[PDB]
Design an enzyme around this catalytic site. Structure first.
Site, PDB file in Angstrom:
ATOM      1  N   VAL A  67       0.966  -1.065   0.000  1.00 38.71           N
ATOM      2  CA  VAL A  67       0.000   0.000   0.000  1.00 38.71           C
ATOM      3  C   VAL A  67       1.028   1.133   0.000  1.00 38.71           C
ATOM      4  O   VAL A  67       1.854   1.300   0.918  1.00 38.71           O
ATOM      5  CB  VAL A  67      -0.761   0.155   1.327  1.00 38.71           C
ATOM      6  CG1 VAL A  67      -1.682   1.379   1.177  1.00 38.71           C
ATOM      7  CG2 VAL A  67      -1.543  -1.112   1.647  1.00 38.71           C
ATOM      8  N   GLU A  68       1.017   1.935  -1.040  1.00 38.71           N
ATOM      9  CA  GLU A  68       2.002   2.998  -1.084  1.00 38.71           C
ATOM     10  C   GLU A  68       1.398   4.367  -0.909  1.00 38.71           C
ATOM     11  O   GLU A  68       0.399   4.699  -1.544  1.00 38.71           O
ATOM     12  CB  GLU A  68       2.751   2.942  -2.422  1.00 38.71           C
ATOM     13  CG  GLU A  68       3.290   1.562  -2.763  1.00 38.71           C
ATOM     14  CD  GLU A  68       4.283   1.646  -3.892  1.00 38.71           C
ATOM     15  OE1 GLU A  68       4.953   2.698  -4.013  1.00 38.71           O
ATOM     16  OE2 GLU A  68       4.356   0.707  -4.708  1.00 38.71           O
ATOM     17  N   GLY A  69       2.079   5.197  -0.143  1.00 36.43           N
ATOM     18  CA  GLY A  69       1.659   6.575   0.136  1.00 36.43           C
ATOM     19  C   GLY A  69       0.855   6.479   1.433  1.00 36.43           C
ATOM     20  O   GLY A  69      -0.372   6.363   1.436  1.00 36.43           O
TER      21      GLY A  69
ATOM     22  N   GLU B 290      10.192   1.469  -9.388  1.00 35.54           N
ATOM     23  CA  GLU B 290       8.876   2.007  -9.113  1.00 35.54           C
ATOM     24  C   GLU B 290       8.035   2.007 -10.386  1.00 35.54           C
ATOM     25  O   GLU B 290       6.877   1.601 -10.363  1.00 35.54           O
ATOM     26  CB  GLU B 290       8.965   3.459  -8.639  1.00 35.54           C
ATOM     27  CG  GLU B 290       7.622   4.042  -8.156  1.00 35.54           C
ATOM     28  CD  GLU B 290       7.076   3.301  -6.916  1.00 35.54           C
ATOM     29  OE1 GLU B 290       5.868   3.401  -6.585  1.00 35.54           O
ATOM     30  OE2 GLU B 290       7.883   2.617  -6.250  1.00 35.54           O
TER      31      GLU B 290
END
Ligand code: FAD
Ligand code: FAD
Ligand SMILES: *[C@@H]1O[C@H](CO)[C@@H](O[C@@H]2O[C@H](CO)[C@@H](O)[C@H](O)[C@H]2NC(C)=O)[C@H](O)[C@H]1NC(C)=O
Ligand SMILES: *[C@@H]1O[C@H](CO)[C@@H](O[C@@H]2O[C@H](CO)[C@@H](O)[C@H](O)[C@H]2NC(C)=O)[C@H](O)[C@H]1NC(C)=O
Ligand code: GZZ
Ligand code: GZZ
EC number: 1.5.3.14
Lengths: 459, 462
Positions: free
Chosen positions: A57-59, A166
């Protein structure tokens, strides 16, 4: 109105849910595979379930809440861990053996970071029309005053970890204006949490689906006939009055609208035939954006031989061949007893590797590890798992990437409907293309556009 | 008016020649190296002279005359041969042994050419500003309906042969609008001729220089004092009134104008200091364009083990690793019986290769050759030559490439003069960037712009 939703990945389930909420319940979701979740998908490897697709889960921890986070961390409480990249400098392996001097590496990293930050300042000054955009590589040349970007093995692997790891494509192909800085981190925060739960990251999709489709009270399995698996859509006919959709098993369905959630890569293949053909403006926007490929190669060993401890999770291999088996991860925390390693490759290497046998790939990987741990006795891995997302006709890749040359307007044409044919998916996300949270929000936005048009006649 | 020209490659000599012709004879040409010719330059390899740089006259037998052709083919009579690529489908090697079926290969080639022809029609319609440009790869996806370009070993080496072998960077990085089609070919012709003469392709540059600089009766050596070799310009100061130029050995010179002919790569490195500093618009234009690298690896063997004969000159290696020692050339006509092979690489491989020993590269190549001709007894190369243009500070690459992202106006900023400072060189050729003819014409063009300013007092640019 009846609406057909093609695909049951995050964006489809999310769109169908938003529609249900607006009261449009005459839905028909057609999914190609035998299960829902799409690119969020686990598998058993070596007695444990690992993520073949999305894994983080990014951010997280920023000024805005990433919508996926609360579901993961609070609602489902999926087991997860914050990733710490602070020790990379101690973990970069020389092509031949052993790690490089930590201090020398920390300075290269800093240098690369500073260039990226100057890039962020520059990006902020470009015009919205995109007329001054440039690749990230171009920005790097400009900021360092050189005819080339990172070019030594160490500089290159740092560059890869910083960008390709990324985006899954090199900086030279990537739009500066549209990737540096990334909204995901800018709005939601700088942290990323690796999901490591046997229920799988996909559980997030199941949870959403269950809020509106019927599930067995004993099973919990979805049993709503509005969801049909093993339905490969192969043709979508549309007219000003409605649509007809045909599946590979020969079924034919009719509806008022169709919401297409298949990946950009699927759209760039000929899996689905549109009749009439989509307009040139649409076709062009589709083929100009990139569907990238990120391959998570898992390996199981008879015993450990790499380091474990503080700062040991992530390590790089500085090959003189850019991107060759360069980014490594070990799961002392996630899969404590396992003896599993994960090496990630992308783009050209991904396409090459998908095209060869697992055994051939395992053998290449074995040579690299022995080169990295010349001092140890490295056992051959016992099992290897090589996900083949680009070869899979239902995905043709792992996630979109914004190439230099495409501006916001053309990006927008991607989201644009064509008569009654609507589109959704991570590649339609206004500011979070590529991410799970982006597939999620895209489902809502797409659904809302259809709602206003269909329900309020405001298109 | 006094003019200093930085660099004695094709463009600088060309420009000086034109100024001389307009009567501007108070000229000073400062050349970094101990010779003229720049990117046109030969060297002794294993007993024969081979070209380290330019080697072909590209664009011949068409509607218009490539200006370089007559000098080469007629005036000097340099030994040369038209290259024929018609038999490639018979010469594509399997990563693991032998060639592929010719019919299979020709179909793939025809398919690739068709995509390209579709690309040219699209390119003609794009907005002149370049604002609608896309990479060659995007065009390929569009026309093949796939989420990727050529991706199998054969298709990839064909792609590389078709594009990287000409431009030195991949299609995905290259501007469609500016390379498909290519003016050089549309205007001057589809053919190309390989120069294989002991005096070298650079003889063309010596010949022009001689048309206006003093040479010795039997030296034939230029001896005009307006040409100074071994003079590295490290700084250029410019003002409304004039210009001052300083070299590394501390020489200082003054003039009304300076014409800079150094490569784009030199400009992107910071070899020459400008004072005052160039304007940002100019700096950005310089960093945005690409300086590519094309490495001609020559190899010498104690005996032949490869095919010779009709359609044998060019052959490809279909590695599953894109761009890996892929384009080969045998010299049955050019260097008969010398037992030499030339493999060409570019871009990423060029940079990797420049950074390691020639012995290591030779060993990588030996492994490829043995996989290619497994039934032969392939002797180890006894000699190898790895040109290192990117590492050379006076060049920093081989030739410019127009990347997706640079537009028409940005390209003009790259060419634009700044005060009394003019620029020239292949990267300044609007339609022939990258070529020897482009360098030659860019010299005449920059000179004329300078002549208008000086002689006609027309000093505004665009
Ligand atoms: C290897 C990998 C790593 C990633 N890493 C992460 C990460 O760690 N963090 C993150 O935020 N994001 C990551 N992502 C991105 C994230 O997984 C996606 O952004 C998201 O899951 C895409 O959702 P979607 O609904 O747009 O597409 P999908 O998930 O592809 O859903 C589309 C669905 O349509 C179906 N379909 C296709 N063709 C047809 C047809 N003809 N008929 C019927 N149905 C069809 C498919 O089977 C699929 O279920 C990763 C993805 C991958 C693959
Ligand atoms: C490997 C290679 C292959 C190519 N193949 C071909 C081909 O087959 N056909 C073709 O048409 N084209 C080809 N070219 C391109 C062609 O050679 C060039 O376009 C052309 O020669 C460039 O000429 P120019 O004057 O712009 O630049 P250059 O030849 O670089 O001239 C610039 C001059 O400036 C000098 N100099 C640099 N910096 C300074 C300084 N600070 N002070 C003073 N002097 C300085 C340099 O030494 C040089 O002599 C190739 C080039 C290379 C290198
Ligand atoms: C993710 O969820 C966990 C689950 O609770 C959070 O940890 C708790 O935070 C509360 C808030 O005061 C504490 O009272 C609990 O004792 C904490 N539990 C543990 C086990 O420490 C955690 O902070 C969450 N992370 C994010 C980024 O939201
Ligand atoms: C290159 O130059 C040679 C040198 O002359 C050309 O060959 C001559 O062409 C004229 C034209 O009809 C003939 O009368 C001569 O007899 C030819 N000479 C020889 C030795 O054959 C040749 O055609 C030129 N090639 C190109 C592409 O211009
Ligand atoms: N930039 C930071 N603050 N930190 C980032 C921390 C690195 C996280 C390492 C996770 C490994 C990468 N997995 C990425 C998969 C996500 C898909 C996103 C594609 C986004 C592409 N976007 C655009 N091209 N615009
Ligand atoms: N297009 C044809 N009709 N045929 C071309 C035949 C192939 C010729 C093969 C010779 C080997 C290539 N030598 C190339 C060096 C030339 C430098 C020029 C670079 C061009 C850059 N141009 C732009 N990016 N706009």
């Amino acid at each position: 109105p009846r609406v057909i939703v093609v695909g049951a990945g995050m964006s489809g389930i999310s769109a169908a849910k938003r529609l249900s909420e607006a009261g449009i319940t005459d839905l028909l979701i057609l999914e190609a595979t035998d299960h829902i979740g799409g690119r969020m998908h686990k598998t058993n490897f070596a007695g444990i379930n690992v993520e073949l697709g999305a894994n983080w889960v990014e951010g997280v921890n920023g000024g805005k809440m990433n919508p996926i986070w609360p579901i993961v961390n609070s609602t489902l409480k999926l087991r997860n861990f914050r990733s710490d990249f602070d020790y990379l400098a101690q973990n970069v392996y020389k092509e031949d053996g052993g790690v490089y001097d930590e201090d020398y590496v920390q300075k290269r990293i800093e240098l690369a970071d500073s260039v990226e930050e100057m890039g962020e300042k520059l990006s902020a000054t470009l015009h919205a029309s995109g007329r001054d955009d440039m690749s990230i590589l171009a920005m790097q040349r400009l900021n360092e005053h050189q005819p080339n970007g990172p070019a030594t093995p160490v500089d290159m692997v740092v560059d890869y970890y910083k960008f390709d790891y990324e985006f899954a494509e090199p900086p030279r192909v990537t739009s500066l204006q549209n990737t540096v800085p990334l909204a995901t981190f800018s709005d939601f925060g700088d942290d990323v949490y690796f999901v490591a739960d046997q229920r799988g990251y996909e559980a997030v999709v199941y949870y959403l689906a269950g809020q509106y489709l019927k599930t067995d009270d004993k099973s919990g399995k979805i049993v709503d006939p509005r969801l049909q698996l093993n339905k490969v859509v192969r043709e979508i006919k549309y007219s000003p009055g409605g649509v007809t959709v045909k599946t590979e098993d020969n079924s034919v369905y009719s509806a008022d609208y169709v919401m297409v959630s298949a990946s950009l890569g699927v759209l760039q293949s000929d899996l689905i035939q549109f009749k009439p053909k989509l307009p040139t403006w649409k076709v062009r926007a589709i083929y100009q954006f990139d569907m990238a490929v990120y391959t998570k190669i898992f390996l199981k060993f008879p015993r450990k031989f790499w380091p474990e401890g503080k700062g040991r999770e992530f390590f790089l291999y500085a090959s003189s061949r850019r991107g060759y088996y360069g980014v490594w991860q070990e799961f002392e925390k996630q899969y404590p007893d396992a003896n599993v390693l994960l090496v990630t490759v992308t783009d050209e290497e991904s396409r090459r590797i998908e095209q060869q046998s697992d055994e051939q790939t395992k053998a290449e990987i074995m040579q690299v590890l022995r080169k990295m741990f010349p001092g140890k006795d490295v056992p051959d891995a016992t099992d290897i798992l090589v996900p083949r997302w680009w070869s899979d006709r239902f995905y043709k890749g792992t996630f979109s990437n914004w190439p230099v040359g495409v501006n916001r307007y053309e990006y927008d044409q991607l989201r644009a409907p064509v008569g009654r044919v609507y589109f959704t998916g991570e590649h339609t996300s206004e500011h979070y293309n590529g991410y799970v949270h982006g597939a999620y929000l895209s489902g809502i936005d797409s659904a809302e556009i259809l709602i206003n048009c269909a329900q309020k006649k405001m298109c």
